[PDB]
Amino acid sequence: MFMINILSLIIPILLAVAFLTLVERKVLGYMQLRKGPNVVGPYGLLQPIADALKLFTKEPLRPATSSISMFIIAPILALSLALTMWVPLPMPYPLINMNLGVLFMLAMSSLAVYSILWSGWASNSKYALIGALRAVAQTISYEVTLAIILLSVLLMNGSYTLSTLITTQEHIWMIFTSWPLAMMWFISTLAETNRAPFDLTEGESELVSGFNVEYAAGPFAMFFMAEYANIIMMNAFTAILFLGASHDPHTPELYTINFVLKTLALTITFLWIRASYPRFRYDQLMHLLWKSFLPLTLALCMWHISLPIMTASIPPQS
Amino acid sequence: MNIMLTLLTNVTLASLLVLIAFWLPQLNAYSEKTSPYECGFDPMGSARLPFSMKFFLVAITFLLFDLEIALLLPLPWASQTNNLKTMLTMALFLLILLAASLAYEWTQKGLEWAE
Amino acid sequence: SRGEYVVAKLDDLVNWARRSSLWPMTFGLACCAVEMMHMAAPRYDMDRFGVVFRASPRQSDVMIVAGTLTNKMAPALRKVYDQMPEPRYVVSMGSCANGGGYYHYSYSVVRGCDRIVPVDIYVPGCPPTAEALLYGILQLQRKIKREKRLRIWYRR
Amino acid sequence: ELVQVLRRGLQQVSGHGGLRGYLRVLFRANDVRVGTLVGEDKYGNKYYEDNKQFFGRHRWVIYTTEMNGRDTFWDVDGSMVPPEWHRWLHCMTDDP
Amino acid sequence: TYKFVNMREPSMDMKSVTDRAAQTLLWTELVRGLGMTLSYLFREPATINYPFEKGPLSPRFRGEHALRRYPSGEERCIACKLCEAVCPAQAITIEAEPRADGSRRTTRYDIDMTKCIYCGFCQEACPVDAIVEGPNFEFSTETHEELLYNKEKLLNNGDKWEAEIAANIQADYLYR
Amino acid sequence: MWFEILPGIAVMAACLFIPGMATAHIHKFTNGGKEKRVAHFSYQWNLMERDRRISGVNRYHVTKGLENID
Amino acid sequence: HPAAHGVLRLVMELSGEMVRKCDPHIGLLHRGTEKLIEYKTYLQALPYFDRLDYVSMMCNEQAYSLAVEKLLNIQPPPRAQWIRVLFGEITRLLNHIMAVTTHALDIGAMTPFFWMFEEREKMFEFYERVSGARMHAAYIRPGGVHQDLPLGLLDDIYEFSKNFSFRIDELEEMLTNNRIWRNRTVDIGVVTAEDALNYGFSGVMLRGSGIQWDL
Ligand SMILES: CCCCCCCCCCCCCCCCC[C@@H](O)O[C@H](CO[C@H](O)CCCCCCCCCCCCCCC)COP(=O)(O)OCC[N+](C)(C)C
Ligand SMILES: CCCCCCCCCCCCCCCCC[C@@H](O)O[C@H](CO[C@H](O)CCCCCCCCCCCCCCC)COP(=O)(O)OCC[N+](C)(C)C
Ligand SMILES: CCCCCCCCCCCCCCCCC[C@@H](O)O[C@H](CO[C@H](O)CCCCCCCCCCCCCCC)COP(=O)(O)OCC[N+](C)(C)C
Ligand SMILES: C=C(C)[C@H]1Cc2c(ccc3c2O[C@@H]2COc4cc(OC)c(OC)cc4[C@@H]2C3=O)O1
Ligand code: SF4
Ligand code: SF4
Ligand code: SF4
């Protein structure tokens, strides 16, 4: 019966990823004065299925100079971690209830960078190596700031339990208390998901395809699925963190609908951002994260430590 | 136990997808097809040659800054103590020292990449 | 027979999937690449047919040879064609790629890209209009619709 | 208002010959617009216009399902237009 | 007469400084770009429904070649070889002889369509309007050999497209 | 259309609905129809184990009220 | 490579991602145009200039026509010259749209390309109406122009021209004040005036360095 819950979490996520791609293409098209997929199925609704079927019936290539074990392992790790990050999210009840769910997401997101690193290095090609090193630089840029932002926001929650965030935001959204932290968190989530304007690891215009340039067919499909699942997961995490839906214990699907709508809004905002800005330079991304975000984040961490004591507003939990 | 089952399920699903990807289609692998890609021309050197890191000092600093967040993460629980003044003083001291280290590295050109 | 019906249905499904998702390599040589861009432009919007450019040859299905192929460049075209995983298709667009064109009698020009790679569709014009290239792509889709790999395997 | 847009959609499905004709046009041309029948072709193609659309979408042809010998329900191409309707369809002239 | 594109100096008053600080900290111009894209999202796209809708063309359009006839059904070509002499790509090959009735007609008329640059010089050179570039542009083939037109193919093209070719010529012959 | 993007968004919303409601319904089904008990600390775990012991069917959610006091 | 802008083999020596040396290898689109021109008549060699720079086709036609007219000691009629200047400016609009949008696309902003290529399509329509070809017109000839304008072309050119400034304004809204675009463009590839003159630069590559020169 827990296996059924696992499947009911895994299969819909993959379906949403598949259709996210269609949504992504259509939104970009209409923002570019065109239509996007509207032939393969009514309103392009069968286009993701055709893409999935085409990719998995195409020949997978194993490069001659590549390291076989890491080359095959990296996409498996990417997709498995992308699926695993969903289990502690309360919608409004988590599949897995952790005392420290936030730390769990932090650690697993930190371990998801190795799929790009091992993939790029094991491809044994120059563009893949450049993509992997760009991933190293990206993580060095965003990690500390993201962690300190998370700590500063959760100081008003009282714990690292994700469900408690629903109780914290029963009357007001946390974005009205920490909007300066919310903006930096949103930018850091763009940087963490390798999304425009921070898509340096792929860098199509600069690096052809980046870390996955040598991947074809099914493994490439899994890398794409992992990336889009990460998009949806991170936006759901942001919606839980800063826009708390009201929960009725006898009426939980109201919370589920509200949370899904907020997550879709944030994902559509991601797609909107991709269509509006030029790409950063990765040294410029590091300088942005270390010279602007880091000092403000440190100051706001001090402020959000002092404020609950200042006003006698410390949250309940130990 | 449930988390172990979830991890096993995810890894099994990914591995099964890899197996179908590699065993369903028809493979025609020859030496030209599997050669490394460098935009149509052969690579000059190896991809296993050293690749300079211009952000090496920032990379080293990242280790100490990463341990600082590990130091700072128990603050939600620390805010429940009776000696609130002491805990606040120590938390502010830790953050001030982190900010001072960042300022020192910034002023001495430690954040500029090597040319 | 039941097996023949099953292989025919699976054949139709695979053909539909392949023709409905055709990914050309981001690859242009000369004047014809401008009309290829105009085919990708909003007026024609090839993306609505499921046709998306991708830079890497490993993630591509179609090579549109759009422009003159010179002797100096032919090995690179052959190499990026060889690095395409199968099934792969080649469209020869324009007079220069089809047969040499204006530069047929040149010391430095390959008289048609079909001397280097096998070609599925030839799109005439100097340049072909973006509408003509779209017609060629839909003709390639129809040709993919006609192919029967599973039936041939079954009748073996 | 939005209700008028919904009513426009409802009259669009109504004016395509009912529900099955609506689905036929949607799955055959990926378009459900209604236009004045300019004329019919001797091979079965039908030609419509609507001058309220912008230039390019103001003339169109619903192809026949049965050409010389082949089934053209799904397999259609621009080469099936005869030369006179070819001249009209590409806006080389205003007169049908 | 010249103008400068990047020779402006920012205002240093407190209000301007605070406005620039607000732009830096709250990302006003980025929201402006987002607003531009959002505005485009609600416009009607410029895409047409090919192949059911076609792009506009002109009576001067240069497409597939055709050989024409007089209203009596006699061919217009007299084998003068002016089109062959003017062809910049040497795409036309002509052989001629006296016909059985003494007429000056071709026995070979080939156009290599993979050599042709579709410049229309041949139809300018023709003194009897015998060779024309028609309006057809959807004649992609599956083989290279299908694009090597002989006299039968061109005569067939003329017979097939004459109804539109004559109307196109009637609408443009006063500009020639 | 711009409203042609809506069907795909609707499909994504329907897919994203399923995990939360599936979790809620499975929790109700496997916990006596009254929500899954949360044990973040050992006191709550002790309460759950005591509930399982006094239930007589080895199920914590089987609740014994004031009908067990003779 | 998408950023190669066609057939260019740029061999680069890098230290990390820092560029130590650039070596452009060209000739992947050398078709031997000049020898072929030596094998043609003056009218037969005109369409080669269409295919030299396939974004500024009529400007190349105009340059070749001016050279041949100077060698012939003849003079084009005034209406031909006005048509030449008008279509040269339309061609300049086409070329600048292509250049700016492909530059932005290489940087990472892919949206203005689609906005401006519809205007490019309309100008292609003007080309086709005047000549019967959307790109390679062969319209400007060493004696003037091949054909007169159709009887309603000027109205359509006016209708297009009175709406283009708003498209430029939208492009500038996207790019001009964007801090990301400025970061990717400001102080990048700086060339001095004297270096630009000695290296043989022309056009914008001079005017960007402050040199006041327009032919
Ligand atoms: C969506 C995620 C969940 C999916 C759930 C299902 C999991 C499916 C498992 C994934 C693999 C899918 C592969 C589908 C094709 C089968 C490939 C292989 O198994 O068949 C052949 C296996 O046969 C071998 O040649 C040897 C056969 C016998 C020798 C060892 C097997 C001994 C078993 C005993 C059989 C006797 C009868 C048993 C009755 C039960 C190998 O052929 P090969 O060309 O290499 O590979 C290319 C396959 N092509 C041709 C289709 C492209
Ligand atoms: C005599 C030497 C002075 C000059 C030499 C300087 C060399 C030493 C460096 C600094 C000396 C300070 C260390 C003193 C030990 C601190 C512990 C003690 O003083 O009490 C604490 C008082 O600490 C307070 O926070 C104030 C002192 C903190 C001073 C701020 C940091 C300044 C240090 C800077 C020097 C270090 C090197 C340079 C760093 C920049 C907490 O008391 P309280 O919590 O009630 O009770 C705890 C017991 N309970 C839990 C059972 C209830
Ligand atoms: C439980 C699931 C397990 C497997 C998972 C895989 C997903 C299932 C497969 C999805 C099926 C959807 C494909 C059907 C789409 C057909 C659409 C139709 O329009 O195509 C027509 C023809 O359709 C095809 O001929 C047949 C398609 C399907 C044939 C058999 C399908 C059997 C699938 C059963 C599942 C098998 C999976 C086995 C593994 C378990 C002609 O269209 P076309 O000419 O192109 O377009 C022209 C465009 N115009 C009209 C504008 C001019
Ligand atoms: C990516 C989509 C939106 C468009 C843009 C584009 C294509 C297809 C191919 C290419 C491309 O842009 C790149 C960069 O700009 C030029 C400019 C060229 O000449 C102006 C040229 O000629 C071969 C080639 C190119 C590249 C390449 O071939 O569709
Ligand atoms: S066929 Fe004509 S338009 Fe195409 S590349 Fe060759 S010269 Fe340029
Ligand atoms: S159109 Fe030009 S290239 Fe083609 S046959 Fe006529 S003269 Fe020769
Ligand atoms: S087609 Fe015209 S120009 Fe050519 S040989 Fe015949 S009559 Fe002379």
From TrEMBL, chain D:
> Which branch of life, at top level?
Eukaryota
Compartments where located? Mitochondrion inner membrane
Query: Is NADP found in the keyword set?
Result: no
Can you supply one Gene Ontology CC term for this chain's record? Answer: mitochondrial inner membrane
Its placement in the membrane is given as: Peripheral membrane protein
| Assigned keywords, A-Z | Electron transport, Membrane, Mitochondrion, Mitochondrion inner membrane, Respiratory chain, Transport, Ubiquinone
The principal localisation class reads mitochondrion
Q: Which family does it belong to?
A: Belongs to the complex I NDUFA12 subunit family.
How this chain assembles, per its entry, is:
Complex I is composed of 45 different subunits.
Function, please?
A: Accessory subunit of the mitochondrial membrane respiratory chain NADH dehydrogenase (Complex I), that is believed not to be involved in catalysis. Complex I functions in the transfer of electrons from NADH to the respiratory chain. The immediate electron acceptor for the enzyme is believed to be ubiquinone.
The protein's name in its UniProt record: NADH dehydrogenase [ubiquinone] 1 alpha subcomplex subunit 12
Organism for this UniProt entry? Sus scrofa (Pig)
Highest lineage ranks of the organism? Eukaryota, Metazoa, Chordata, Craniata, Vertebrata
Automatic annotation (TrEMBL), chain E:
Main location per the UniProt record: mitochondrion
Q: Which residues bind [4Fe-4S] cluster 3?
A: 119
Q: What is this protein called?
A: NADH dehydrogenase [ubiquinone] iron-sulfur protein 8, mitochondrial
The record lists its disulfide bonds as 83-87
Task: Give the protein's function.
Answer: Core subunit of the mitochondrial membrane respiratory chain NADH dehydrogenase (Complex I) which catalyzes electron transfer from NADH through the respiratory chain, using ubiquinone as an electron acceptor. Essential for the catalytic activity and assembly of complex I.
Q: Which family does it belong to?
A: Belongs to the complex I 23 kDa subunit family.
Q: Tell me how this protein sits in the membrane.
A: Peripheral membrane protein
**Cofactor(s) required for function per UniProt:** [4Fe-4S] cluster
Whole sequence portion shown: 37 to 212 of 212
Subcellular localization(s) per the UniProt record: Mitochondrion inner membrane
Reaction catalysed by this enzyme: a ubiquinone + NADH + 5 H(+)(in) = a ubiquinol + NAD(+) + 4 H(+)(out)
Alphabetical UniProt keywords: 4Fe-4S, Electron transport, Iron, Iron-sulfur, Metal-binding, Respiratory chain, Translocase, Transport
Q: Which GO terms describe its cellular component?
A: mitochondrial inner membrane
- Could you say which EC number(s) this protein's record lists? 7.1.1.2
Binding, [4Fe-4S] cluster 1: 77, 80, 83, 126
UniProtKB/TrEMBL annotation, chain F:
Stored InterPro entries: NADH_Ub_cplx-1_asu_su-1
| Keyword Transmembrane on entry | yes
Question: What are the subcellular locations of this protein?
Answer: Mitochondrion inner membrane
What are the entry keywords?
Electron transport, Membrane, Mitochondrion, Mitochondrion inner membrane, Respiratory chain, Transmembrane, Transmembrane helix, Transport
Q: Which GO terms describe its cellular component?
A: mitochondrial inner membrane; respiratory chain complex I
Write down a Pfam family by its short name. Answer: MWFE
Would the keyword Electron transport turn up in this protein's UniProt record?
Answer: yes
Membrane topology designation: Single-pass membrane protein
Described function: Accessory subunit of the mitochondrial membrane respiratory chain NADH dehydrogenase (Complex I), that is believed not to be involved in catalysis. Complex I functions in the transfer of electrons from NADH to the respiratory chain. The immediate electron acceptor for the enzyme is believed to be ubiquinone.
Which protein family is named in the record?
Belongs to the complex I NDUFA1 subunit family.
What is known about its subunit structure?
A: Complex I is composed of 45 different subunits.
The name of this protein is NADH dehydrogenase [ubiquinone] 1 alpha subcomplex subunit 1
Q: Top-down, what is the taxonomic lineage of the species of origin?
A: Eukaryota, Metazoa, Chordata, Craniata, Vertebrata
Name of encoding gene: NDUFA1
Automatic annotation (TrEMBL), chain G:
Instruction: Tell me what organism the protein belongs to.
Output: Sus scrofa (Pig)
Covered range within the whole protein? 88 to 302 of 463
Quaternary organization = Core subunit of respiratory chain NADH dehydrogenase (Complex I) which is composed of 45 different subunits. Component of the iron-sulfur (IP) fragment of the enzyme. Interacts with NDUFAF3. Interacts with NDUFAF7. Interacts with CERS2.
Sites where Symmetric dimethylarginine occurs are at 31
Family assignment? Belongs to the complex I 49 kDa subunit family.
Full protein name: NADH dehydrogenase [ubiquinone] iron-sulfur protein 2, mitochondrial
Name the source's superkingdom.
Eukaryota
